[PDB]
Symmetry: none
Subunit: 289 residues, 2 copies
């Protein structure tokens, strides 16, 4: 089916309450359907034998149509491959790019994609390691002296670390093409599960922050986490909603997530993140002051 369920913001408070009744009954009903969306969309380039070492998780693959293909002077197989997908935005198509966390083996491909797409913004929603589990390579420089990742060099002009997130100003270049890239790393993600922390504002400050800097990245805003679908998806939804609530008096979270999954699988992976989005949609309380 085609998922959609617009709700007037004036009734959103009652709505989510009615969604949680009977042990999140309605919620799991909608989410369970979200799990079906896009289950039969080809991702043949992802299945290719020599691309397997480029897919972090054997089961989180990019659809063929929405995949961000790299530009190489031909040859080989899967030479244009990177586990990434364009995701529609509130302002235009291919507004975002949802990728998995780069691997020691797809590290150079990542920076190649940042340049070829002219993405001047990267949002990282996970730490390299969490609870003694590898989640993402540290694909960027550890210091200020430039590191050459393939043909693209990377120079971290500055590294600003805060309490919940971290900012980095990189300056990558190829041949005679210098390009700036801002990097925001949310490190205090609410575990992922739960949630709680009335301070869901912390994620909202982060979103607002990235958002108020989007007016600089001609290319897509590259967002990623580990698999690039669970937290990545929640983020994108929030960056959408933030704007959509600002300009409308209704929100269709179901449609939103449904939209996103048609472009990349598992976008917003758990019923917890999906309910968390509604918890955050209390952005209405604020739109009332």
């Amino acid at each position: 089916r085609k998922l959609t369920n617009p709700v007037q913001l004036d009734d959103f408070d009652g709505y989510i309450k009615d969604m949680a009744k009977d042990s999140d009954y309605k919620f799991s009903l909608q989410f369970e359907e979200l799990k079906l969306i896009g289950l039969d969309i080809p991702h043949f380039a992802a299945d290719l034998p020599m691309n397997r070492c480029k897919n972090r998780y054997t089961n989180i693959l990019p659809y063929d149509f929405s995949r961000v293909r790299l530009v190489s002077m031909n040859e080989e197989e899967g030479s244009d491959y990177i586990n990434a997908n364009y995701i529609p935005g509130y302002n235009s198509p291919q507004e975002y790019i949802a990728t998995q966390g780069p691997l020691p083996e797809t590290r150079n491909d990542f920076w190649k994609m940042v340049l070829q797409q002219k993405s001047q913004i990267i949002v990282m929603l996970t730490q390299c390691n969490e609870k003694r589990r590898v989640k993402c390579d540290h694909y960027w420089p550890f210091t200020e002296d430039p590191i050459a990742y393939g043909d693209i060099t990377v120079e971290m002009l500055s590294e600003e670390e805060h309490t919940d997130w971290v900012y980095r100003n990189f300056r990558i270049s190829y041949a005679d093409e210098v390009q700036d890239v801002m990097h925001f790393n949310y490190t205090a993600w609410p575990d992922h599960g739960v949630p709680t922390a009335n301070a869901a504002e912390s994620i909202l400050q982060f979103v607002q922050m990235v958002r108020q800097k989007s007016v600089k990245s001609k290319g897509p805003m590259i967002i990623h986490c580990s698999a690039g679908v669970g937290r990545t998806g929640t983020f994108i939804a929030l960056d959408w909603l933030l704007q959509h609530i600002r300009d409308h008096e209704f929100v269709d979270i179901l449609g939103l997530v449904s939209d996103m999954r048609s472009y990349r699988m598992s976008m917003v992976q758990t019923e917890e993140q999906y309910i968390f989005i509604h918890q955050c949609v209390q952005l209405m309380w604020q739109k009332k002051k």
Copy 2:
């Protein structure tokens, strides 16, 4: 829903036996493959093509381009569909986006066509339809009638030489914008009826035409723009024939099913009829040529 990657590479020496088997039981297998080919890309977005103002730019309401592979016009216009044109990049035997598959230009998307031609640096155009077939409108005569330069919006086109042949015609145009100048060859095959195929008598004809366009392929910077009416059936069988000409040359096998299945994921209806899908196989007995020359 579809979930299997269609493909069936057949060794050229077993082609006679393979096409024989595909023809058994009144083309039983040719249908099995074709019916599944028809499922491809059915669930691929094409919103740009549905925008209110792009509707008049679509020759047919049921033949639209997929968002991911569509060709975009560049311009300052900040209005709806300003970058739109019913066209898709189609992978190549040589490179992705080696061709551009479009519908025949409409009187109202004509200027858009030439813009694409210059912006993509397409120096070759393959038109597989007559502007009119049996009193039915198939494609606008979007190009000049005389050697007199004609301004199509911001691009003037001057027809340099016109050569009307048996089953086809050749034309060399020089288009320009400001100082930017570009030569473009135009190959019009007029013996391919819409929704159909050349006659059994034009079998050699069309293959010679593909040969002629293949020799020139190299002289073009951008993708070869090939088009017909809806830009999918005749345009799809051509792109396939061009591939196979090259592949058959350097290889010992063909995978027509994978080829067509491939094209169809970049633009809908590529190789529209089962008859055209089979025509391709008959043509693949291009091995005849191979086995001879050498």
